[model samples]
Target: KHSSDICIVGAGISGLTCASHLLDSPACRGLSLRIFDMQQEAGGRIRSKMLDGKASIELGAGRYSPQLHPHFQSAMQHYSQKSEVYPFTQLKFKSHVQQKLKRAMNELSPRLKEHGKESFLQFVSRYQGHDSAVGMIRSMGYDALFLPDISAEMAYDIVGKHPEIQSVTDNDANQWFAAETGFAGLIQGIKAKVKAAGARFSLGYRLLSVRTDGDGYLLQLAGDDGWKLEHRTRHLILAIPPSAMAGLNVDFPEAWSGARYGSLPLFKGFLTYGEPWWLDYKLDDQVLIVDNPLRKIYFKGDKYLFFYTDSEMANYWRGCVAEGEDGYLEQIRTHLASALGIVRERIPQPLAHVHKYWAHGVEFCRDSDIDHPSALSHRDSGIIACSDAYTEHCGWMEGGLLSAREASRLLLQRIAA
Candidate 1:
């Protein structure tokens, strides 16, 4: 049997951030900390891969805005010298769509409050009398911001309560940026510091069950070889999605298992070519929002093109492709040609291509005070759960960092007591 003072399950951004903060806390100086993750590598959803051994592209969480995320901003400053960071150029919409979006923004008013409980489609259909305006706003803005399945109440909270969306609507500027080294690099930097500070990480260890053992917790972990090992820790931190937590046979609050966290499906496809063909249209460093299945297209440098689809579109394409085939890439290329107003025959085949589909990419929860399940629970039980699903930032990296900070602070107070 192996034991530690604290055991953290999952090595995603939240788990890694929690460990880093706990190690830095003076009160946690002498505590033995051990982290377990099912994957061999860390950086959960923040993944970056090299294309043809040349261009580095992000396959997971990509960018953040310093103007919005204070926790991320602080971390960037502290690791400024170690990592490469830069601001993303403002996104430019297609000319026709841009004009319609402007009109929609001008038309929005307090009158929208009456339809606040309706779906985005229902609200827009009633609010905007013109079909073209509704189509443009739905495809360009609403689809990209909230999933097709997002309800009106959630949409209102998103645009009304969130400053980032309000900033764009008010100023017509996109103030987002990314780490040149990719989000994976950011997680690696923090992992290095945590390891150097004496935290132990057990990669490829999966938590099978958890049960109460006296005042501490008994954990059953299984490795890739199917060998089970027993571990005991005085405190347990669950830094994973609620959906994943539901699968674990743990002795914890029933509320944790009952939380209704909704996840959105996401699909990202990357195509690399010898040259940037879209540059001919003056779209070298811009983002293209289309009404087709390929909802968002991002131009990276002069070599890579990234395509994104969310909600229903993602579910549709995901069903069309075989597990490891390029069938979906052909569809993406054809759509790209149409969006660029170029002949499909003129579009060159990419030198290298890759794609990723996250079935549960982003978790959505209501912003309410009626005892949501993701909140701090069973403090006396000594088992806590933290994830981006619980935060207002939801899909963004900021949510993970924010939740980790709050969870770490609470755990410190408990230990100090």
Candidate 2:
């Protein structure tokens, strides 16, 4: 049996941030903290790898804008690490189609305030007063925006505010940034601070069930190596996504919060060619949004060429890769040739590659429930739940960090009293 003052499940950005916040407060002194994650390693959604120690290739969370993300910017300052600003939205637009799409997006923002429970596709169609507008929207990348269940407001935030997508946002003031070397360093530094503050981590451990144990909680955990244990904590905080939480014995959505939640599948593949072949096309540090399952393609100067896709396209790429690496590379080669209009034979085989398909990569509350609380608590048993999904920044690291701070703040208040 293991026991602690506080137990946090899901050692992702939200969980790590929560621990860091709690350790920073003098009020939480002498509190024993333990963080658990299902993965063998702790750095959750923010997964990126260094390419021969030269550059970073993001396979999970990507790019943050300092102008838009206050928490993220402040954290970068705290970590004392500088993020490199890059041109994230270098979308090429035709002379006429550009203004029409831009105006439609600009107008839709105002109309969304008065919108109801309708899909973004339907809302756009009605706004433009024609179905062709929807088709034109579909022609742009981000197939996820038109997902039948995506609310108008949710879709706008996903497509409009995101730095990578140029189909909507053309804001020049908002600069997108990535870590100079890799994202893992930031999480590692944060974890170091957490450890210095007496917080311990148990990787490869999953919180199986949470039940009320008198005034606290009894957590059942199963490790990857067929070991099971029970731990008691004075307070429990879950920083996992809604989909993962639904599997627990604890009640969710019904008792958690009034908000409805959903997840978007996302896939990112980075193809590293031995030579910077894309440089010949003048696509250094450039991005392209195409009308295919490939969705958005990025040429990372001398590092790698990558493609990110969401919605059904994410699942499609997963299946293609499942057929074996050969089949997947063949598909990538074919698409690369078609996308860049290069001779099929001129497309060189990638020297190395890395990719991942996150089934619940980006989770969020329904648009109508944007006003939900940052942290949800079981009023009696002292179990608190937090997710980036609760915050307006949902699906971004900034949201997760904010959510964690709120969770830590609430717990610290309980202890002081």
Candidate 3:
């Protein structure tokens, strides 16, 4: 049997951040640390598939907001050997369309109460909202899904909202929709440092079961070959998503699960990062284009990253890649046509594109209980179950990093005592 002072499960951003912090701390220098991830690679959901040396395309995880994410900044400053930080600036609106649209939506909400059964379209019709706003959503090719298809399930999945309630008032909704930083370079820099710090990575080791033993935990792991291996460690921190955690038979406490389910609406966000197309089109440098089929597209000129928020667009062009450079390029072309109305022949094809469609990227499970810690402390047993599900900001990379950092601190304090 092998043993360690701490064991972390799932090599996503949260797990890596936590492990990195412990290893770097002088107080934790005497403690042995090891991390396990089921995937062949690290960074978990914050992944960008590789092409040659550069990333082909990114999927679920995209950028980090440096101003709002101090911890992420600290990690980058201390751990990353080279900084690829890019400052993001929002594009100046060419007109007052967004504001006008918002006003119309606001005016209609109260009137729709009279009928009590009007669809979103019917409500919008009564408001006589901005054509640009309606056109942006309608043209983006997701109008059907965005309107009537908006439900507790879809909202909870993407944005973690309950359709029955209005949690984010219109005044604050745009703030919640602020931009984030592209972290492809930042993550690679951190991974290099993690490997340098003597952390052993075992890719493709999927965890099957976790059991509390006499004083530690036993993990059953499965490989692609269908072979099973047992791993034991003193402390376990899970950084995988709620869905993955649930798949492993880890059930959330009833009270906590229900509340999160009601309040939060989860939604999927699909992304692509490739060669600079916005630059060639002279459309880079904070351009916010409202095409008919997608609501809004942001081109961060400095980072060369594109963001899309349509569920329908995600469904159409995600799974058609064949691997390598050629497949990635094909996906990028599809994105141009579907989201931007740019045909395949309009511009030079891209070299690569990575696709990740997470059902819970931007939202949490509604009716999910927020108070329960994903990682719990058992004093007598000396074990803890650490995860992002334990916190208020359950979906963000910051939440995962914070969860891991706090869990590591708690475990270390206990060991010292």
Measured by TM-score, the strongest candidate is: 2
lDDT of 2 at 176: 78
Alpha carbon lDDT of residue 155, candidate 3? 27
Local accuracy of candidate 1 as per-residue lDDT tens digits, 1-417: 689998889899899999988999889878999999988999888888877887778888776656677788678677662334332334455466565654575465465567666556556666666565456454453353443445555655455333223432464243566677677778888899989989999999899888889988999989988878899998788998766777787533364434456677788888888777777777766667677678777777687888777777788778867643566667777888888887788788887888888888887564333345333545347577889887777777888888898888778887888
Candidate 2: stretches off by over 4 Å:
93-99, 106-117, 127-131, 166-170
For residues 1-417, write the lDDT of model 3, one tens digit per residue: 366667777777777776776677777666676777777777766665443353233555544445445666566566442334332333344345534433444554566446534444444445464453465235322333345534422322222121111122232222111222335555666666776777666678888887787777888888878878888887666656655665664443331233333112222323334556566556654534354323445554524455454455444334433245466455555656654456767655544333455554443434343355544554444444455555655556666766777777877776567
Q: Could you give the candidate ranking by lDDT, starting with the highest? A: 2, 1, 3
All models, RMSD in angstroms: 3.1, 2.2, 6.8
Better of 2 and 3 by TM-score: 2
Off by over 4 Å in 1: 81-97, 129-134, 141-149, 156-168, 171-174, 250-259, 367-375
Structural similarity to truth (TM-score) of each candidate:
0.89, 0.93, 0.67
Clashes of each: 0, 0, 43
User: Model-by-model lDDT, in order?
Assistant: 0.72, 0.80, 0.53
Residue 66: error of model 1 in Å?
Answer: 1.0
- Candidate 3 — number of clashing residue pairs? 43
Q: Rank the candidates by TM-score, best first.
A: 2, 1, 3
lDDT of 2: 0.80
Error of 3 at 219 (Å): 1.0
